[PDB]
Amino acid sequence: DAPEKNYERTMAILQIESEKAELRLKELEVRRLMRAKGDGPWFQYPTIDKALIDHSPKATPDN
Amino acid sequence: PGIVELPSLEDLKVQEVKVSSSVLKAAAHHYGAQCDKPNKEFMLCRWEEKDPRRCLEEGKLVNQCALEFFRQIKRHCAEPFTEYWTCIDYSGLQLFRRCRKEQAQFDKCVLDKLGWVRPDLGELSKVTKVKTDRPLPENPYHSRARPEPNPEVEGDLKPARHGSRLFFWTM
Numbered sequence: 446d447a448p449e450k451n452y453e454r455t456m457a458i459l460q461i462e463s464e465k466a467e468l469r470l471k472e473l474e475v476r477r478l479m480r481a482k483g484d485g486p487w488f489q490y491p492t493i494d495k496a497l498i499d500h501s502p503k504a505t506p507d508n
Numbered sequence: 509p510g511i512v513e514l515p516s517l518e519d520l521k522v523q524e525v526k527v528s529s530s531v532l533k534a535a536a537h538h539y540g541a542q543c544d545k546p547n548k549e550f551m552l553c554r555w556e557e558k559d560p561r562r563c564l565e566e567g568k569l570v571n572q573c574a575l576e577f578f579r580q581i582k583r584h585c586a587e588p589f590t591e592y593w594t595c596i597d598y599s600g601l602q603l604f605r606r607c608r609k610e611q612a613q614f615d616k617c618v619l620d621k622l623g624w625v626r627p628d629l630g631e632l633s634k635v636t637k638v639k640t641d642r643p644l645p646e647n648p649y650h651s652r653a654r655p656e657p658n659p660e661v662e663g664d665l666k667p668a669r670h671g672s673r674l675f676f677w678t679m
């Protein structure tokens with residue numbers, strides 16, 4: 446191979462791996478903040494559906 | 509938290525209906541026919557305000573209308589009514605089916621002297637409509653501000669950047 450080819454292919458390898466490494470660091474930081482605050486699409490542990498609530502006029506009025 | 513705000517004892521004084529349950533059961537159908545409107549205003553106020561402290565004037569109108577109902581019974585048809593609720597009062601379960609001739613006497617005298625018609629089967633169980641002048645309760649549960657939901661997802665789903673990014677797997 447040419448030193449041009451090896452050199453620039455090395456640069457492409459370094460680009461792709463540095464991009465993946467910074468994305469892994471952002472992956473860890475996003476996971477930390479979403480477990481801590483709980484305001485993202487992840488770690489949304491289920492609560493009770495409010496579509497299950499009956500809203501009809503019941504037998505007694507104090508409810 | 510906050511101090512609970514109760515009405516005074518003078519806000520609760522009203523002339524009571526001091527009659528027995530068999531007396532109330534004997535003229536129950538004429539009470540439902542004749543005392544319809546303030547009773548339904550009260551029960552609409554009671555199922556909408558969801559607070560008996562917001563219903564005291566409507567309950568007092570209920571009590572006034574019931575007292576006028578039994579005074580209008582007592583002036584004209586006191587003795588067939590007494591004959592009828594005594595026979596209702598004899599039974600333990602207080603059956604209407606056991607006392608049809610005293611019922612016929614009471615309903616006859618009531619239709620002849622007071623013009624009241626006893627309702628048919630099905631009528632008192634109707635869901636009626638009530639014309640009120642009080643405003644609709646804007647928050648009867650006193651529900652505070654709801655929490656804002658989590659943001660939804662949006663945008664076209666692009667591929668993963670350089671695959672899985674799992675240590676060396678390039679896809």
Ligand SMILES: CCCCCCCCCCCCCCCCCC(=O)OC[C@H](COP(=O)([O-])OC[C@H](O)COP(=O)([O-])OC[C@H](COC(=O)CCCCCCCCCCCCCCCCC)OC(=O)CCCCCCCCCCCCCCCCC)OC(=O)CCCCCCCCCCCCCCCCC
Pocket residue numbers: 676677678679
């Ligand atoms: C227009 C339509 C038509 C188009 C046609 C185009 C194709 C034309 C050719 C047709 C054939 C296509 C074949 C697949 C494409 C080439 C894949 C390839 O070489 O990837 C290089 C791949 C990564 O190297 P690369 O230089 O970065 O990528 C070059 C390309 O970009 C590679 O491309 P990439 O970057 O996209 O690769 C993605 C990713 C790249 O890889 C990675 O990201 C790295 C992780 C890979 C897995 C590592 C696991 C390590 C731990 C487990 C080790 C297990 C034991 C090892 C083997 C023991 C003996 C069986 O791949 C994987 O992770 C796949 C998993 C590994 C399977 C590789 C494909 C095998 C196909 C044939 C199977 C036959 C058996 C093979 C032996 C079984 C084990 C492989 O090399 C390895 O992982 C080394 C292991 C050996 C790979 C198999 C070589 C394929 C041909 C084998 C022929 C001889 C078989 C002999 C008999 C059976 C064995 C006794």
